[PDB]
Design an enzyme around this catalytic site. Structure first.
Site, PDB file in Angstrom:
ATOM      1  N   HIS A  57     -11.871 -12.618 131.772  1.00 53.91           N
ATOM      2  CA  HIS A  57     -11.825 -13.810 131.084  1.00 53.91           C
ATOM      3  C   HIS A  57     -13.101 -13.783 130.071  1.00 53.91           C
ATOM      4  CE1 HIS A  57     -15.357 -14.787 133.768  1.00 53.91           C
ATOM      5  NE2 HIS A  57     -15.805 -15.169 132.546  1.00 53.91           N
ATOM      6  N   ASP A 113      -9.410 -10.962 137.977  1.00 51.36           N
ATOM      7  CA  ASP A 113     -10.076 -11.280 136.748  1.00 51.36           C
ATOM      8  C   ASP A 113     -11.000  -9.992 136.195  1.00 51.36           C
ATOM      9  OD1 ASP A 113     -11.382 -12.902 134.629  1.00 51.36           O
ATOM     10  OD2 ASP A 113     -12.797 -13.021 135.919  1.00 51.36           O
ATOM     11  N   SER A 194     -21.169 -14.034 133.668  1.00 53.06           N
ATOM     12  CA  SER A 194     -19.595 -13.527 133.860  1.00 53.06           C
ATOM     13  C   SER A 194     -19.491 -12.108 133.841  1.00 53.06           C
ATOM     14  CB  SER A 194     -18.798 -14.258 132.718  1.00 53.06           C
ATOM     15  OG  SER A 194     -18.965 -15.552 132.848  1.00 53.06           O
TER      16      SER A 194
END
Length: 263
Positions: A57, A113, A194
């Site tokens: 992402h 992801d 992230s």
């Protein structure tokens, strides 16, 4: 940089015993702008290939965006700021001069992801890098260690001393993600963390940070985050461009887990 005061500098005693995996983690920018965190992973050929795991992402899984990467190594506060004091939530003194530019995409996959990049430049001995092991076994763990760049600021460590559990992204029943519960006054993660790794107690990568409800003011089960699993990513989307196995076990050794490699 600046991040929440509940966060813990890596040079703090919480980093003792982890000074190898601390050196695997880097912050990076995408098209010039600080974006996400990633980390080096070892493979079964033990060859120091610059495999850099991050999250899908973050948008690095295209040839064009991967080419734009700048990675900043050893970006951490020089001294331990006491956690949960305003010192920890103040602008830090990290250096961002240990850098390398450019990468290619090896694989990317939306469901667990993950993006595996390969950095263009071999390891500079001056950066004293570490390539962390991984563990792809289908199980849970009694705790876990996050090393990460919250708000893409100075490197932090966050500990979990609760059992992990399997979830789908969002928290429903599923098995693509590990749910990690942070300590009630400990470090958490924040935007920009992230793609940061989660490690087993034995210091092997289990997944990389998707996101979740945590913040320094979160209570109860909202003080948690979800990590896309290496287990899921190992097989990924069914071909080399969307899975880890071809890259991380090129020697076809059949290994379920491996340890790290120092520079």
């Amino acid at each position: 940089g600046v991040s929440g005061s509940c966060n813990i500098d890596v040079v703090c005693p919480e980093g003792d015993g982890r000074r190898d995996i601390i050196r695997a983690v880097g912050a990076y920018s995408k098209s010039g702008t600080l974006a996400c965190t990633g980390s080096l992973v070892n493979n079964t050929a033990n060859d120091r290939k610059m495999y850099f795991l991050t999250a899908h992402h973050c948008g690095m899984g295209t040839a064009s965006t991967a080419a734009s990467i700048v990675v900043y190594w050893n970006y951490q506060n020089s001294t331990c700021r006491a956690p949960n004091t305003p010192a920890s939530g103040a602008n830090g003194d990290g250096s961002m001069s240990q850098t390398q530019s450019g990468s290619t995409v090896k694989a990317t996959y939306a469901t667990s992801d993950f993006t595996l990049l390969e950095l263009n430049n071999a390891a500079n001995p001056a950066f004293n890098l570490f390539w962390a092991g991984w563990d792809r076994r289908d199980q849970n763990y009694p705790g876990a260690i996050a090393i990460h760049h919250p708000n893409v600021a100075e490197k932090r460590i966050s500990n979990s001393t609760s059992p992990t559990s399997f979830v789908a992204w969002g928290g429903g029943a599923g098995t693509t993600h590990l749910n990690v519960q942070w300590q009630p006054s400990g470090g958490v993660t924040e935007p920009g963390s992230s793609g940061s790794p989660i490690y087993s107690p034995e210091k092997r990568v289990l997944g990389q940070l998707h996101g979740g409800p945590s913040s320094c003011s979160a209570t109860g089960t909202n003080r948690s985050d979800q990590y896309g699993r290496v287990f899921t990513s190992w097989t990924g989307g069914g071909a080399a461009a969307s899975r880890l196995s071809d890259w991380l076990d090129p020697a076809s050794t059949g290994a379920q887990f491996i340890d790290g490699l120092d520079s």
